[PDB]
Amino acid sequence: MENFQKVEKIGEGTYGVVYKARNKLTGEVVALKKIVPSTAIREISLLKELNHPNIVKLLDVIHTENKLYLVFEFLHQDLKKFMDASALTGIPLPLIKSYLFQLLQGLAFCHSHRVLHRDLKPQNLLINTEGAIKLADFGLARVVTLWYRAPEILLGCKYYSTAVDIWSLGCIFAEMVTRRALFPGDSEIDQLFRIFRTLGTPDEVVWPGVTSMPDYKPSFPKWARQDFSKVVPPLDEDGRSLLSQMLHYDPNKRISAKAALAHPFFQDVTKPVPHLRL
Ligand SMILES: Brc1cnn2c(NCc3cncnc3)cc(-c3ccccc3)cc12
């Protein structure tokens, strides 16, 4: 640690405080996360090899004094701040599409290595001046916001898979378009019920096996599904079709990152430069 000079606190991650810091040696500016079980050390070590342009690079892992520090590449802004900053005007559709495409490329990569994020949220999607967007805190999982949590997690599924990340990204996609959180639940049941109220209460017809799930209750209220035209106006039909697929109840039916990349929505994708005030 003596090799780093703390510049400032850039948030309070789920595991510890994250600091912008300077390598007293190389002079490199990095993000320093202060989080040990051998399993954790080994798992984290694996993440160091998981390199991709849309994944925040984990530079080094430092274990000392039974303490654990993760040194990451530093990015100046996150999607939440950018969304807040662009609230009056909204993020231009072409930039939303570019960001969604890049994130799907990142997910496609991680997923192909059997690595899940599990906690995707605007705060952990980092952006730069070049129009790039990157997933932060990938593989780390293996008040905390429930807004992006997939229904199978909320329903007590113990062995959920990659589809949970597609669900979270579908929620974030909707939020970028509408400028309002899709399902801002403030408790597990409120989260579940917000999802039901919009997509309809799931049943054996649309989600075979849902009624047997651990936290499923026959006493759940039965709400009708709403039309996406009401959910994310004025997103075009291509966008709404993609969204509807990323939000399928059945994790097995939910579109994969790979398939999502081929969706017609991305036929005209480009890479705009955002306007960032750093
Ligand atoms: Br790795 C990493 C690399 N950059 N980075 C950023 N940068 C965005 C930023 C935010 N505030 C000031 N400067 C830059 C935020 C978080 C993060 C922090 C807290 C919670 C979740 C993610 C992690 C992280």
Side-chain angles (χ1 to χ4, degrees):
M1 241 0 69
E2 59 270 357
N3 286 288
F4 294 96
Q5 164 185 74
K6 257 150 223 205
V7 174
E8 95 197 30
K9 197 161 346 234
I10 61 184
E12 339 197 289
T14 339
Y15 310 91
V17 70
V18 178
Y19 275 71
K20 173 179 198 182
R22 184 173 296 103
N23 183 317
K24 299 181 188 173
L25 271 232
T26 58
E28 210 174 17
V29 160
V30 299
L32 193 64
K33 181 177 211 167
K34 192 238 246 227
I35 310 307
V36 178
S38 301
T39 58
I41 292 305
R42 311 212 189 82
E43 175 76 48
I44 281 335
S45 284
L46 293 167
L47 295 193
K48 252 188 315 208
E49 297 192 345
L50 196 74
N51 303 299
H52 177 99
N54 301 109
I55 296 309
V56 178
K57 174 191 207 24
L58 168 65
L59 301 176
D60 272 299
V61 162
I62 309 167
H63 192 17
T64 72
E65 316 233 63
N66 311 354
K67 244 319 234 336
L68 186 62
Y69 303 92
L70 308 196
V71 70
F72 288 101
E73 135 186 39
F74 173 84
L75 275 85
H76 291 84
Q77 199 154 307
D78 66 58
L79 185 67
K80 182 192 195 283
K81 277 152 206 248
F82 185 60
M83 279 198 299
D84 282 345
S86 305
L88 296 201
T89 148
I91 300 156
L93 176 65
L95 185 54
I96 289 174
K97 178 176 308 196
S98 176
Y99 281 174
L100 185 54
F101 191 69
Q102 288 177 70
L103 297 169
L104 287 167
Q105 286 181 70
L107 265 69
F109 177 75
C110 295
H111 292 169
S112 76
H113 284 78
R114 265 107 182 134
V115 169
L116 279 62
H117 192 293
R118 218 236 86 141
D119 196 25
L120 267 197
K121 63 197 122 131
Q123 184 175 6
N124 57 40
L125 301 183
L126 309 182
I127 62 172
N128 69 16
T129 51
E130 307 292 336
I133 187 153
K134 308 186 181 197
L135 298 133
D137 290 2
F138 228 106
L140 290 206
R142 169 170 193 96
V143 180
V144 178
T145 191
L146 303 171
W147 299 359
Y148 309 94
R149 181 165 302 175
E152 61 264 36
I153 294 180
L154 296 165
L155 287 177
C157 188
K158 311 156 179 87
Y159 306 105
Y160 48 77
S161 200
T162 58
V164 306
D165 294 330
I166 293 306
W167 179 276
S168 312
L169 185 51
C171 290
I172 297 167
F173 176 27
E175 190 172 342
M176 282 194 279
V177 168
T178 68
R179 300 173 232 170
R180 186 146 302 178
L182 182 56
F183 307 127
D186 66 347
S187 77
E188 296 211 19
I189 205 55
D190 182 59
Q191 187 69 30
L192 190 60
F193 288 0
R194 281 177 173 273
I195 295 174
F196 292 178
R197 281 187 260 266
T198 294
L199 303 176
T201 298
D203 58 27
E204 288 291 327
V205 173
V206 303
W207 190 353
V210 68
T211 66
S212 51
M213 306 185 53
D215 299 327
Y216 173 85
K217 314 283 171 189
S219 53
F220 278 165
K222 316 251 221 10
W223 289 284
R225 176 177 191 90
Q226 291 185 5
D227 298 304
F228 275 47
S229 60
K230 179 185 169 64
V231 186
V232 293
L235 189 60
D236 62 60
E237 178 56 11
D238 278 324
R240 295 193 314 258
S241 160
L242 175 52
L243 183 56
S244 79
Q245 302 175 52
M246 296 176 76
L247 298 189
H248 274 325
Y249 267 124
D250 192 336
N252 212 66
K253 283 194 205 69
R254 204 164 303 146
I255 195 159
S256 66
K258 253 213 88 231
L261 287 167
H263 191 283
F265 186 62
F266 299 111
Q267 193 266 336
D268 68 348
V269 67
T270 64
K271 193 193 192 74
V273 210
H275 190 243
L276 296 189
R277 177 160 205 203
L278 305 169

mmCIF file with all atom_site columns, all heavy atoms in Angstrom, residues 60-72:
data_model
loop_
_atom_site.group_PDB
_atom_site.id
_atom_site.type_symbol
_atom_site.label_atom_id
_atom_site.label_alt_id
_atom_site.label_comp_id
_atom_site.label_asym_id
_atom_site.label_entity_id
_atom_site.label_seq_id
_atom_site.pdbx_PDB_ins_code
_atom_site.Cartn_x
_atom_site.Cartn_y
_atom_site.Cartn_z
_atom_site.occupancy
_atom_site.B_iso_or_equiv
_atom_site.pdbx_formal_charge
_atom_site.auth_seq_id
_atom_site.auth_comp_id
_atom_site.auth_asym_id
_atom_site.auth_atom_id
_atom_site.pdbx_PDB_model_num
ATOM 1   N N   . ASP A 1 60 ? -3.891  -5.150  -10.656 1.00 0.00 ? 60 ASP A N   1
ATOM 2   C CA  . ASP A 1 60 ? -3.170  -5.946  -9.685  1.00 0.00 ? 60 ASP A CA  1
ATOM 3   C C   . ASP A 1 60 ? -4.005  -6.214  -8.451  1.00 0.00 ? 60 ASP A C   1
ATOM 4   O O   . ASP A 1 60 ? -4.934  -5.466  -8.132  1.00 0.00 ? 60 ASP A O   1
ATOM 5   C CB  . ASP A 1 60 ? -1.890  -5.214  -9.272  1.00 0.00 ? 60 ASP A CB  1
ATOM 6   C CG  . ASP A 1 60 ? -0.713  -5.521  -10.189 1.00 0.00 ? 60 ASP A CG  1
ATOM 7   O OD1 . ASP A 1 60 ? -0.322  -6.711  -10.284 1.00 0.00 ? 60 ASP A OD1 1
ATOM 8   O OD2 . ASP A 1 60 ? -0.157  -4.571  -10.782 1.00 0.00 ? 60 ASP A OD2 1
ATOM 9   N N   . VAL A 1 61 ? -3.639  -7.275  -7.738  1.00 0.00 ? 61 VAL A N   1
ATOM 10  C CA  . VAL A 1 61 ? -4.298  -7.641  -6.506  1.00 0.00 ? 61 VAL A CA  1
ATOM 11  C C   . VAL A 1 61 ? -3.230  -7.630  -5.412  1.00 0.00 ? 61 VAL A C   1
ATOM 12  O O   . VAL A 1 61 ? -2.178  -8.237  -5.568  1.00 0.00 ? 61 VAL A O   1
ATOM 13  C CB  . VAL A 1 61 ? -4.920  -9.052  -6.616  1.00 0.00 ? 61 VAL A CB  1
ATOM 14  C CG1 . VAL A 1 61 ? -5.210  -9.626  -5.243  1.00 0.00 ? 61 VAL A CG1 1
ATOM 15  C CG2 . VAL A 1 61 ? -6.166  -9.010  -7.456  1.00 0.00 ? 61 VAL A CG2 1
ATOM 16  N N   . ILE A 1 62 ? -3.471  -6.875  -4.344  1.00 0.00 ? 62 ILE A N   1
ATOM 17  C CA  . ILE A 1 62 ? -2.490  -6.783  -3.274  1.00 0.00 ? 62 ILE A CA  1
ATOM 18  C C   . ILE A 1 62 ? -3.024  -7.256  -1.937  1.00 0.00 ? 62 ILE A C   1
ATOM 19  O O   . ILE A 1 62 ? -3.867  -6.602  -1.324  1.00 0.00 ? 62 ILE A O   1
ATOM 20  C CB  . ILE A 1 62 ? -1.954  -5.360  -3.116  1.00 0.00 ? 62 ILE A CB  1
ATOM 21  C CG1 . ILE A 1 62 ? -1.477  -4.805  -4.459  1.00 0.00 ? 62 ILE A CG1 1
ATOM 22  C CG2 . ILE A 1 62 ? -0.830  -5.329  -2.107  1.00 0.00 ? 62 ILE A CG2 1
ATOM 23  C CD1 . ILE A 1 62 ? -1.229  -3.302  -4.434  1.00 0.00 ? 62 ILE A CD1 1
ATOM 24  N N   . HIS A 1 63 ? -2.496  -8.381  -1.464  1.00 0.00 ? 63 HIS A N   1
ATOM 25  C CA  . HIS A 1 63 ? -2.881  -8.926  -0.171  1.00 0.00 ? 63 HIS A CA  1
ATOM 26  C C   . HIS A 1 63 ? -1.766  -8.693  0.836   1.00 0.00 ? 63 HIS A C   1
ATOM 27  O O   . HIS A 1 63 ? -0.658  -9.188  0.655   1.00 0.00 ? 63 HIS A O   1
ATOM 28  C CB  . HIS A 1 63 ? -3.144  -10.434 -0.279  1.00 0.00 ? 63 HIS A CB  1
ATOM 29  C CG  . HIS A 1 63 ? -3.823  -11.010 0.920   1.00 0.00 ? 63 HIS A CG  1
ATOM 30  N ND1 . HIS A 1 63 ? -4.480  -10.229 1.848   1.00 0.00 ? 63 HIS A ND1 1
ATOM 31  C CD2 . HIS A 1 63 ? -3.960  -12.291 1.341   1.00 0.00 ? 63 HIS A CD2 1
ATOM 32  C CE1 . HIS A 1 63 ? -4.996  -11.004 2.786   1.00 0.00 ? 63 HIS A CE1 1
ATOM 33  N NE2 . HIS A 1 63 ? -4.698  -12.260 2.500   1.00 0.00 ? 63 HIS A NE2 1
ATOM 34  N N   . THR A 1 64 ? -2.065  -7.948  1.898   1.00 0.00 ? 64 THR A N   1
ATOM 35  C CA  . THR A 1 64 ? -1.078  -7.678  2.941   1.00 0.00 ? 64 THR A CA  1
ATOM 36  C C   . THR A 1 64 ? -1.771  -7.376  4.254   1.00 0.00 ? 64 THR A C   1
ATOM 37  O O   . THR A 1 64 ? -2.743  -6.630  4.288   1.00 0.00 ? 64 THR A O   1
ATOM 38  C CB  . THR A 1 64 ? -0.152  -6.493  2.579   1.00 0.00 ? 64 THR A CB  1
ATOM 39  O OG1 . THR A 1 64 ? -0.886  -5.261  2.659   1.00 0.00 ? 64 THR A OG1 1
ATOM 40  C CG2 . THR A 1 64 ? 0.431   -6.662  1.174   1.00 0.00 ? 64 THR A CG2 1
ATOM 41  N N   . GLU A 1 65 ? -1.261  -7.951  5.341   1.00 0.00 ? 65 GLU A N   1
ATOM 42  C CA  . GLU A 1 65 ? -1.854  -7.736  6.651   1.00 0.00 ? 65 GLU A CA  1
ATOM 43  C C   . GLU A 1 65 ? -3.231  -8.356  6.655   1.00 0.00 ? 65 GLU A C   1
ATOM 44  O O   . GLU A 1 65 ? -4.143  -7.878  7.335   1.00 0.00 ? 65 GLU A O   1
ATOM 45  C CB  . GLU A 1 65 ? -1.961  -6.240  6.944   1.00 0.00 ? 65 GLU A CB  1
ATOM 46  C CG  . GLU A 1 65 ? -0.719  -5.447  6.565   1.00 0.00 ? 65 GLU A CG  1
ATOM 47  C CD  . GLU A 1 65 ? -0.199  -4.604  7.712   1.00 0.00 ? 65 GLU A CD  1
ATOM 48  O OE1 . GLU A 1 65 ? 0.209   -5.185  8.742   1.00 0.00 ? 65 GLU A OE1 1
ATOM 49  O OE2 . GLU A 1 65 ? -0.212  -3.360  7.590   1.00 0.00 ? 65 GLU A OE2 1
ATOM 50  N N   . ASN A 1 66 ? -3.391  -9.415  5.872   1.00 0.00 ? 66 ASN A N   1
ATOM 51  C CA  . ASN A 1 66 ? -4.678  -10.070 5.768   1.00 0.00 ? 66 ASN A CA  1
ATOM 52  C C   . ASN A 1 66 ? -5.631  -9.087  5.120   1.00 0.00 ? 66 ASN A C   1
ATOM 53  O O   . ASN A 1 66 ? -6.852  -9.279  5.129   1.00 0.00 ? 66 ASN A O   1
ATOM 54  C CB  . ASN A 1 66 ? -5.178  -10.473 7.156   1.00 0.00 ? 66 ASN A CB  1
ATOM 55  C CG  . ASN A 1 66 ? -4.116  -11.203 7.968   1.00 0.00 ? 66 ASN A CG  1
ATOM 56  O OD1 . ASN A 1 66 ? -3.030  -11.509 7.461   1.00 0.00 ? 66 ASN A OD1 1
ATOM 57  N ND2 . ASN A 1 66 ? -4.420  -11.481 9.236   1.00 0.00 ? 66 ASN A ND2 1
ATOM 58  N N   . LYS A 1 67 ? -5.060  -8.018  4.565   1.00 0.00 ? 67 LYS A N   1
ATOM 59  C CA  . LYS A 1 67 ? -5.844  -6.997  3.879   1.00 0.00 ? 67 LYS A CA  1
ATOM 60  C C   . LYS A 1 67 ? -5.809  -7.256  2.383   1.00 0.00 ? 67 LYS A C   1
ATOM 61  O O   . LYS A 1 67 ? -4.856  -7.833  1.862   1.00 0.00 ? 67 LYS A O   1
ATOM 62  C CB  . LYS A 1 67 ? -5.309  -5.593  4.193   1.00 0.00 ? 67 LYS A CB  1
ATOM 63  C CG  . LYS A 1 67 ? -6.284  -4.719  4.956   1.00 0.00 ? 67 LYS A CG  1
ATOM 64  C CD  . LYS A 1 67 ? -7.697  -4.890  4.424   1.00 0.00 ? 67 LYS A CD  1
ATOM 65  C CE  . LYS A 1 67 ? -8.307  -3.552  4.059   1.00 0.00 ? 67 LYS A CE  1
ATOM 66  N NZ  . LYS A 1 67 ? -7.665  -2.440  4.807   1.00 0.00 ? 67 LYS A NZ  1
ATOM 67  N N   . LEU A 1 68 ? -6.867  -6.863  1.695   1.00 0.00 ? 68 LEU A N   1
ATOM 68  C CA  . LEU A 1 68 ? -6.945  -7.088  0.262   1.00 0.00 ? 68 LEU A CA  1
ATOM 69  C C   . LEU A 1 68 ? -7.281  -5.799  -0.479  1.00 0.00 ? 68 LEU A C   1
ATOM 70  O O   . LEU A 1 68 ? -8.296  -5.151  -0.191  1.00 0.00 ? 68 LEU A O   1
ATOM 71  C CB  . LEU A 1 68 ? -7.988  -8.161  -0.041  1.00 0.00 ? 68 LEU A CB  1
ATOM 72  C CG  . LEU A 1 68 ? -8.121  -8.652  -1.477  1.00 0.00 ? 68 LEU A CG  1
ATOM 73  C CD1 . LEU A 1 68 ? -6.828  -9.297  -1.967  1.00 0.00 ? 68 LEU A CD1 1
ATOM 74  C CD2 . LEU A 1 68 ? -9.292  -9.619  -1.588  1.00 0.00 ? 68 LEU A CD2 1
ATOM 75  N N   . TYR A 1 69 ? -6.407  -5.423  -1.414  1.00 0.00 ? 69 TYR A N   1
ATOM 76  C CA  . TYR A 1 69 ? -6.616  -4.232  -2.252  1.00 0.00 ? 69 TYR A CA  1
ATOM 77  C C   . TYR A 1 69 ? -6.613  -4.660  -3.706  1.00 0.00 ? 69 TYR A C   1
ATOM 78  O O   . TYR A 1 69 ? -5.734  -5.405  -4.141  1.00 0.00 ? 69 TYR A O   1
ATOM 79  C CB  . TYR A 1 69 ? -5.489  -3.210  -2.057  1.00 0.00 ? 69 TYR A CB  1
ATOM 80  C CG  . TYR A 1 69 ? -5.286  -2.755  -0.637  1.00 0.00 ? 69 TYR A CG  1
ATOM 81  C CD1 . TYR A 1 69 ? -4.392  -3.410  0.196   1.00 0.00 ? 69 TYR A CD1 1
ATOM 82  C CD2 . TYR A 1 69 ? -5.978  -1.663  -0.130  1.00 0.00 ? 69 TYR A CD2 1
ATOM 83  C CE1 . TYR A 1 69 ? -4.192  -2.996  1.486   1.00 0.00 ? 69 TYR A CE1 1
ATOM 84  C CE2 . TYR A 1 69 ? -5.776  -1.232  1.162   1.00 0.00 ? 69 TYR A CE2 1
ATOM 85  C CZ  . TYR A 1 69 ? -4.887  -1.907  1.972   1.00 0.00 ? 69 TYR A CZ  1
ATOM 86  O OH  . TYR A 1 69 ? -4.679  -1.496  3.268   1.00 0.00 ? 69 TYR A OH  1
ATOM 87  N N   . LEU A 1 70 ? -7.566  -4.139  -4.472  1.00 0.00 ? 70 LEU A N   1
ATOM 88  C CA  . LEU A 1 70 ? -7.652  -4.424  -5.886  1.00 0.00 ? 70 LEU A CA  1
ATOM 89  C C   . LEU A 1 70 ? -7.344  -3.113  -6.597  1.00 0.00 ? 70 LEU A C   1
ATOM 90  O O   . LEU A 1 70 ? -7.953  -2.107  -6.300  1.00 0.00 ? 70 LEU A O   1
ATOM 91  C CB  . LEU A 1 70 ? -9.086  -4.840  -6.257  1.00 0.00 ? 70 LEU A CB  1
ATOM 92  C CG  . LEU A 1 70 ? -9.754  -5.965  -5.454  1.00 0.00 ? 70 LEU A CG  1
ATOM 93  C CD1 . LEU A 1 70 ? -10.992 -6.500  -6.214  1.00 0.00 ? 70 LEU A CD1 1
ATOM 94  C CD2 . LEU A 1 70 ? -8.766  -7.084  -5.183  1.00 0.00 ? 70 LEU A CD2 1
ATOM 95  N N   . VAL A 1 71 ? -6.385  -3.133  -7.510  1.00 0.00 ? 71 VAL A N   1
ATOM 96  C CA  . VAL A 1 71 ? -6.031  -1.929  -8.254  1.00 0.00 ? 71 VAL A CA  1
ATOM 97  C C   . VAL A 1 71 ? -6.634  -2.056  -9.650  1.00 0.00 ? 71 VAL A C   1
ATOM 98  O O   . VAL A 1 71 ? -6.371  -3.033  -10.377 1.00 0.00 ? 71 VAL A O   1
ATOM 99  C CB  . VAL A 1 71 ? -4.495  -1.723  -8.347  1.00 0.00 ? 71 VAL A CB  1
ATOM 100 C CG1 . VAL A 1 71 ? -3.865  -2.742  -9.243  1.00 0.00 ? 71 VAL A CG1 1
ATOM 101 C CG2 . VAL A 1 71 ? -4.167  -0.317  -8.860  1.00 0.00 ? 71 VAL A CG2 1
ATOM 102 N N   . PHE A 1 72 ? -7.497  -1.113  -10.003 1.00 0.00 ? 72 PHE A N   1
ATOM 103 C CA  . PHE A 1 72 ? -8.154  -1.161  -11.314 1.00 0.00 ? 72 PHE A CA  1
ATOM 104 C C   . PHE A 1 72 ? -7.754  0.024   -12.159 1.00 0.00 ? 72 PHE A C   1
ATOM 105 O O   . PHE A 1 72 ? -7.362  1.061   -11.646 1.00 0.00 ? 72 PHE A O   1
ATOM 106 C CB  . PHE A 1 72 ? -9.681  -1.102  -11.158 1.00 0.00 ? 72 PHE A CB  1
ATOM 107 C CG  . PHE A 1 72 ? -10.285 -2.346  -10.609 1.00 0.00 ? 72 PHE A CG  1
ATOM 108 C CD1 . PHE A 1 72 ? -10.652 -2.417  -9.272  1.00 0.00 ? 72 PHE A CD1 1
ATOM 109 C CD2 . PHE A 1 72 ? -10.572 -3.418  -11.439 1.00 0.00 ? 72 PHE A CD2 1
ATOM 110 C CE1 . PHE A 1 72 ? -11.253 -3.573  -8.762  1.00 0.00 ? 72 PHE A CE1 1
ATOM 111 C CE2 . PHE A 1 72 ? -11.172 -4.561  -10.942 1.00 0.00 ? 72 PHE A CE2 1
ATOM 112 C CZ  . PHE A 1 72 ? -11.510 -4.640  -9.602  1.00 0.00 ? 72 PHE A CZ  1
#
